[PDB]
Enzyme design. Structure first.
Site, mmCIF file in Angstrom:
data_model
loop_
_atom_site.group_PDB
_atom_site.id
_atom_site.type_symbol
_atom_site.label_atom_id
_atom_site.label_comp_id
_atom_site.label_asym_id
_atom_site.label_seq_id
_atom_site.Cartn_x
_atom_site.Cartn_y
_atom_site.Cartn_z
ATOM 1 N N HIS A 286 0.647 -1.058 0.278
ATOM 2 C CA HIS A 286 -0.115 -0.412 -0.061
ATOM 3 C C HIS A 286 0.719 1.394 0.343
ATOM 4 O O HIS A 286 0.405 2.050 0.465
ATOM 5 C CB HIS A 286 -0.678 -0.114 0.807
ATOM 6 C CG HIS A 286 -1.481 -0.820 1.329
ATOM 7 N ND1 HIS A 286 -2.994 -1.460 0.764
ATOM 8 C CD2 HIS A 286 -1.539 -2.290 2.149
ATOM 9 C CE1 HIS A 286 -3.038 -2.977 0.890
ATOM 10 N NE2 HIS A 286 -2.865 -3.031 1.610
ATOM 11 N N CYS A 287 2.295 0.960 -0.695
ATOM 12 C CA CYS A 287 2.971 2.476 -0.825
ATOM 13 C C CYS A 287 3.142 2.892 0.173
ATOM 14 O O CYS A 287 3.371 3.905 0.615
ATOM 15 C CB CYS A 287 2.235 3.495 -1.887
ATOM 16 S SG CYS A 287 2.406 3.193 -3.187
#
Ligand SMILES: Cc1ncc(COP(=O)(O)O)c(CNc2co[nH]c2=O)c1O
Ligand SMILES: Cc1ncc(COP(=O)(O)O)c(CNc2co[nH]c2=O)c1O
EC number: 2.8.1.7
Lengths: 414, 414
Positions: free
Chosen positions: B362-363
């Site tokens: 999720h970055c």
């Protein structure tokens, strides 16, 4: 003669309306182009059926969105005949692409004594990034002079480009003069002097076939909104060897490999230069616009625009007191001025007649001063324009001249 | 209780389809949101009726396009309660806005000894720009520690932020933990220490009301694609006094006043920070999305998501061998992991059941390492999601657990 202009116009819904009681005559495609039903319905199908974030391959809609986005990338690669998809970077437009070149290549490869060489006819997007780059690096900015007809002499290129030149930035086609610049020969000259070449192809890409391998351009920038595609998306092409050695201009998600607290590593090309959630729908619509233009044929569009430009030049020469700027051989546009009438009033009267043209400096103030004018009017053509529309334009210009002449003679009567 | 979820779902055509023979259950809105008919038809009407380049006021279609674009700007200003349209800059997304702050403010205001303070829970868009800025300026990057439940202690903020801190960059809502950070108090702390505050509001803006005057945030970044708007457009808000003193991050047309051969002057705000042809259709569609959300009511959306989040947390606690990360009070998302099952397989099985969730980092790799995990699964909610969909999610998670347990016991049998 493969081109049926009626069937083509039938695909653009925006053309079929009236403005001020007159049928719309849109002659402002150099500012932005109109879109066929294929592109609009492509955006529609994306938002209606398979919108999702890309580069995850986790659920079905995400896979479909990723496939559409990367397939549009491959479509662009085929469209400009690039060697690899790694050389195709999606940006928000030509201006951003040129700024990326100026930030990641120029500001990292310019020393005091180096030269950046541009021309007097460049749009502002191909001027100010280089100004800022040479100011940041202490380099020197130089200008290739222009001929009397607004063309570029190859000998002037050889004179301006020297052993200290590292970058030559030039437009493929002038959005003002309509000049088509000798990009291939200029690239050979720049490479002979040890420089790279950056081509502003915002005005060429929509109207003529692009072959970056035949051009041997080192960088090439283009804008979707001018070639029947959605707004807010463009392309930066760069030779893979150059892009591999350039650092990213933007940082964030999707463009990273490893992220530590203080250090990070980047993805491989082309995703190294695409930070954050990309322009998914816009890129897919640009792919659809490419499909549309390629099914029509870029050579056919070029020949149609050559016919339109020759017709427009002849009919403009039939008008008294009208000055046209640029060479005879040109792309599909005419920049001009009416004697005794400011171009803003010309374009106001023309819009009152339903005709849409541009008035102003066209983002090229140094060229305007080279032309010794403060502003100009411009009518630009595309694949949906006809000779009857040019007839309407020249008749409205004659009416405008007569109207302002007789407004002059009645106020002098007073 | 003003919110009718059936009537709301009726406006999103993409929800009414099947995937792998199962009705679609889209629980990935933190990655990107879906669009109502209002936004899609706004884009349609733009491309069908009044597409043209903006900021010319010369012909009628151009005037209509300019009016739509600047009216969308005013809609954004009202939406986040900014004082002036000069404080509203259209960008291509949150990542680009944060990069603009890091380029034009950080790299121009950071000296050796200065501090940039962020948190461990920040997405990559709110990390790497600051890394690069402090590396370019020789400054120092610092991290605010997190509590055991993934929240931020105000005392930890006061400890981390010092007299040498010039920038505090923090997310309004975590896209992983669901944490809602005390942005107003952190802004007061940063201002007490002589620093500005930069808020990453990509995850907060779509789901809760934003009041930049009550937040007293110095900068605020948001993304259209997460709030029912088109892709490829976002907003940078900055206090007018700060934006006036910042130099542009991009150079070209539309953002200039005078252009000489070597020197140029810039337009006033906000156009100083908008180079080239802007994201016309995307910005107008973002205005339409704002109209949609405001007619529904952001407080109503927030309460609906609170109900969804409480329901999801309770039902997740009913599952054996499932770990949920983050605090109890949270936004509308659940990041989790199944014991003995990698989240990628979880999300594959869920998509086979028609359920769309996200799997990966999720970055936010530093947060993943703070959580001592390599990857997680995440289900995120929005205004079109229901409790029945969360029931489907938890039933599919139970089925996934059973399936992998019995795949384990048969291969052990061998
Ligand atoms: C030759 C050329 N280069 C660069 C640009 C900038 O492209 P953008 O980033 O997509 O805006 C334009 C757009 N030129 C014009 C836009 O409006 N009127 C024009 O003559 C152009 O014609
Ligand atoms: C909190 C936060 N900040 C910044 C960004 C980046 O925004 P963008 O520039 O529009 O891409 C995101 C998007 N986060 C996610 C995108 O996909 N999955 C996600 O969790 C986010 O959630």
């Amino acid at each position: 003669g493969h081109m049926n202009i009626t069937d083509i116009r039938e695909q653009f819904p925006i053309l079929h309306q009236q403005v001020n009681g007159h049928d719309l005559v849109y002659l402002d495609s150099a500012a932005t182009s109109q879109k066929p039903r294929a592109v609009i319905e492509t955006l529609d199908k994306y938002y209606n059926q398979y919108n999702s974030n890309v580069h995850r391959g986790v659920h079905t809609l995400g896979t479909r969105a990723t496939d559409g986005y990367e397939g549009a990338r491959e479509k662009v690669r085929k469209f400009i005949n690039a060697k690899s998809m790694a050389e195709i970077i999606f940006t928000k437009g030509t201006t951003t692409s040129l700024n990326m070149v100026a930030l990641s290549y120029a500001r990292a490869n310019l020393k005091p004594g180096d030269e950046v060489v541009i021309t007097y006819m460049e749009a502002h997007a191909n001027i100010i990034p280089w100004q800022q780059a040479v100011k940041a690096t202490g380099a020197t900015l130089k200008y290739i002079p222009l001929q009397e007809d607004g063309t570029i002499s190859l000998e002037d290129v050889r004179e301006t480009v020297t052993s200290n030149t590292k970058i030559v930035a030039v437009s493929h086609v002038s959005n003002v003069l309509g000049t088509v610049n000798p990009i291939k020969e200029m690239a050979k000259i720049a490479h002979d002097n040890g420089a790279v070449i950056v081509v502003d192809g915002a005005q060429s890409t929509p109207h003529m076939k692009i072959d970056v391998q035949d051009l041997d351009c080192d960088f090439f920038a283009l804008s979707s909104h001018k070639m029947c595609g959605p707004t807010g998306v463009g392309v930066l092409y760069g030779k893979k060897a150059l892009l591999e050695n350039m650092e990213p201009a933007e940082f964030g998600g999707e463009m990273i490999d490893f992220v530590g607290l203080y250090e990070s590593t980047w993805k491989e090309l082309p995703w190294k230069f695409e930070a954050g959630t990309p322009i998914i729908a816009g890129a897919i619509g640009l792919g659809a616009a490419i499909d549309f233009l390629e099914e029509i044929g870029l050579d056919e569009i070029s020949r149609h625009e050559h016919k339109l430009a020759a017709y427009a030049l002849e009919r403009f020469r039939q008008l008294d007191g009208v000055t046209v700027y640029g060479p005879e051989e040109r792309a599909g546009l005419v920049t001009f001025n009416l004697d005794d009438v400011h171009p803003h009033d010309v374009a106001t009267v023309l819009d009152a007649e339903g005709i849409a043209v541009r008035a102003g400096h066209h983002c090229a103030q140094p060229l305007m001063k080279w032309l010794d004018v403060t502003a100009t009017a411009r009518a630009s053509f595309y694949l949906y324009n006809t000779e009857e529309e040019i007839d309407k334009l020249v008749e409205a210009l004659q009416k405008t001249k007569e109207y302002f002449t007789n407004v002059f003679v009645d106020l002098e009567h007073h």
